[PDB]
């Protein structure tokens, strides 16, 4: 019912669940659906160690700033994405929800900042910014401004001025037990035969056998000098299996 | 990644891996020549010594 | 506040097994530092400690009665249950459950602050 | 509830941790990360001052009576900002992030039994508004040597640890051990300073001390045994001999002369020289036309 | 069980000080506690850890523990202080209560 | 100024002592310091005796562990 | 050549074909070396009838 | 190798690492040649005890 502002964007952590991205990708409700480092149609059969949903409301003309390598008032002072961002940016028009006849000034943005933000930085300071050489003492005045400005967000505003609800899904894949997996249909485990396999999103072909390698509890797989995986931990039985090419 | 954007990433790996393999083979041809010369000398010593 | 309520059979025959349940409120049996003990008091006699259970399922029993005493806890209902077997007429007493203050590091019982109302149990034919 | 009441040692080969969660065995692996430099000066406290966090912290303690209970991480360490409080108690470890108003001299108020091996809590005198994170798990717990590595990367507070017995009186062990991952906390806060929390009795304390070092961006060569355990490591920046080993990817170097690096004199200062023109460009006459 | 001995009774006049002793083997090493039980009622903790009162307990109640002997003292004993007083001590997890002292006023 | 750095070592089966050659530079520019035509050699003691070459430095100079 | 570069990927193999005979040339070069190694041994040792 | 290609640029050096050991291989090859040149001289002139 309520979204966060762009200056104080909200991070919701998604974990320990089964995801379904076909409900989002196949929805006509989204005006923007841009993925980086991953294809939307393949997103439904991968696993992640965590997923973060960063949400806020901005103007239509600001939507272009929600991308890798972009700059601007939002990109620099409110919400910054990394150049190597992996994830999907989703946005839709919310003029019928977030706009008000007298203006919806509940939503604001940062206009004044000493320096550009680092990726995923969130600045919630409300202290007065000194633009000149004389101190503010917490009081607004000449060269002393409150750092955040409000948006009009009226239902009669032009498309570029209307509010849009934005959700950015950041996908991280570290070497850890996946906490989020798309629509999944597991099968039985077969050993001592040449098989094609998918372990928590890891695809390959080879013979699987029980391993004598003593993995530590935080380790899910091992690697060779060629950067190939030569052992995995079964996600359900926690058994360590050796992987040898057919 | 999907097929138009996979063919960019893959081509980068092919180029690098192909270059690495060509480097290996060239070095082996040069080393082979050195061994051949040694073998020719050994064969001469076998005959004459 | 903290309260404890004893319930169970008020009459058993010789050689029968008695089960007493202590229903507690104001605290959980799964909470660290929590312990619940059982004590009996025969008519006109001094109190005798039987057993107590710790939140971590560790248990203490009186050496002279240990062979007849079993204590368990229900982690869902917040109840402590004491089972006393092979009872004789001489085991007639009022039974109480109470909260136990617990020392940490080397874990030891300290004192009983909150006591229940107690239940009288008679052993007879 | 608030009460208003260093030496240096040498860290020989301590502060090495498993850089990632990848299984490796019978292999020499080169990695670059924030590690405690070998043979470094580690600050020795006996004392609960607020210390800088820098890039990362190596914290070790030696104690018998469990006096050190936890740490506070943050910036201003007051009600103005979010801060991280990690405290061990009687049965568990409590990790919270809130706008805490900390005491001028925060601690746990604990009394002891007649037997010096037993204790009970009296009060808590460390500080909790606008809480955003809470986590509870098992306690982080001859003298006890407890080593921790604290890193803060992309909002994640990563804790590595190792707990071993020590038979030394007042120093760190001269030997190698790798620290394992303990917990990864998705917190998203700014940490620049931290403080150590002790359990005091009516206030004084028993005999305990702790050491604080700092991590640096350095390259190490790690040796994994047949069981996937790191048994040795080389700090490539320590000396020319270590540099050679790291270059050759071997812990043994034969007689000879090796090229290991290239030296380069660095710039002493930066200078800027532009024209002595002063007038401003007439851009206004173009755009404001 | 842990051996603990109390006097069978104490008798004082109102306004006087009552003194109830409790003798053990290792009371000088462990902590003692006292409970006050009225007829038909559950016992109430009066003193814990030798000399500490629970909230709600009148300042009339005090005590000490030395030389393997623990005591409970009631200063300005009232006629409402009539009860059976029991002492307890734990010997390294071994429980024990005294026989109980009947205090009259 | 820049150049190669070479490390001269007897072998770890013998010793952990090393000497460093700063190739093609003056000893005055580097900051047992011996200037050779191969560069500045530091950590080695120059002697006026002469032996069979052990570890070659260059320009007629060799080094060894004594 | 194909396995080293592409493993078991068909997408990679199809792209690799665009490079022509590079793989064949490398395989031929290594084969020539392998044959020479047996010739070298015979020239040295097989000098007796 | 690094200086020839990247000079003193850190941005370049970081990219160069993505190519693996190519620089190390080239340095090794040239070193091997340099050593041989001294061996060649000794083989010709140092024939007298
Ligand atoms: C030690 O910390 C633990 C964990 O936070 C406390 O345990 C919880 O305490 C709350 C009350 O704050 C109870 O409602 C929960 O039932 C407890 N849970 C568990 C699993 O025990 C514990 O009380 C603290 N103990 C002491 C002595 O400080
Ligand atoms: C579910 O997975 C866990 C390990 O994550 C395993 O211990 C447990 O046995 C599994 N349950 C079943 C029914 O396989
Ligand atoms: C505690 O001491 C500080 C000075 O160190 C003082 O400013 C503060 O007011 C004192 N707090 C109280 C409650 O006296
Ligand atoms: C450590 O400090 C001592 C002086 O106390 C100093 O001599 C030594 O060089 C220092 N070690 C390092 C690595 O800085
Ligand atoms: C505890 O330590 C004190 C000295 O601080 C000592 O007198 C006492 O006897 C010790 N208690 C035990 C049980 O050792
Ligand atoms: C939450 O933070 C606001 C300031 O942003 C403060 O006024 C409010 O009292 C805090 N709420 C709580 C429960 O601390
Ligand atoms: C953390 O706080 C310090 C001030 O102590 C500030 O200089 C720094 O920029 C802050 N970093 C972030 C990410 O807020
Ligand atoms: C590896 O583990 C085995 C037991 O499985 C043990 O006998 C051996 O000593 C260990 N190796 C090392 C280097 O610790
Ligand atoms: C026009 O002049 C005003 C100052 O009077 C300035 O703020 C504005 O940037 C100028 N427009 C230009 C240079 O395009
Ligand atoms: C290493 O030193 C030992 C004596 O400590 C010697 O026996 C051995 O032969 C040496 N190895 C080599 C390769 O010289
Ligand atoms: C550098 O070395 C040369 C000899 O190789 C010498 O002539 C010159 O004076 C030296 N420069 C300095 C500053 O010592
Ligand atoms: C070597 O001889 C020179 C003179 O030619 C002399 O100046 C130098 O000190 C001598 N060095 C040693 C180690 O004898």
Author numbering:
A (entry chain F): 345 to 590
B (entry chain A): 984 to 1032
C (entry chain B): 1 to 125
D (entry chain A): 14 to 18, 26 to 66, 80 to 160, 163 to 176, 186 to 246, 258 to 344
E (entry chain L): 1 to 105
F (entry chain A): 591 to 621, 641 to 675
G (entry chain A), H (entry chain C): 738 to 786
Show me the paper's own sentences about this structure:
The S glycoprotein is subdivided into two functional subunits, designated S1 and S2, that interact non-covalently after proteolytic cleavage by furin during synthesis. The S2 subunit contains the fusion machinery and undergoes large-scale conformational changes to drive fusion of the virus and host membranes, enabling genome delivery and initiation of infection.
To provide a structural framework for understanding the S2X303 binding breadth, we characterized its Fab fragment bound to B.1.617.1 S using cryoEM. As a result, S2X303 defines a new class of NTD-specific mAbs that differs from S2X333 (23), a canonical ultrapotent NTD-specific mAb, and from P008_056 (70), which interferes with biliverdin binding, with respect to their footprints and angles of approach. Moreover, S2X303 exhibits better cross-reactivity compared to all other mAbs and can bind to a large number of variants although not all of the ones tested. Furthermore, we found that although S2X303 neutralized G614 S pseudovirus, it could not neutralize the B.1.617.1 S and B.1.617.2 S pseudoviruses, putatively reflecting enhanced off-rate and reduced binding affinity not detected by ELISA.
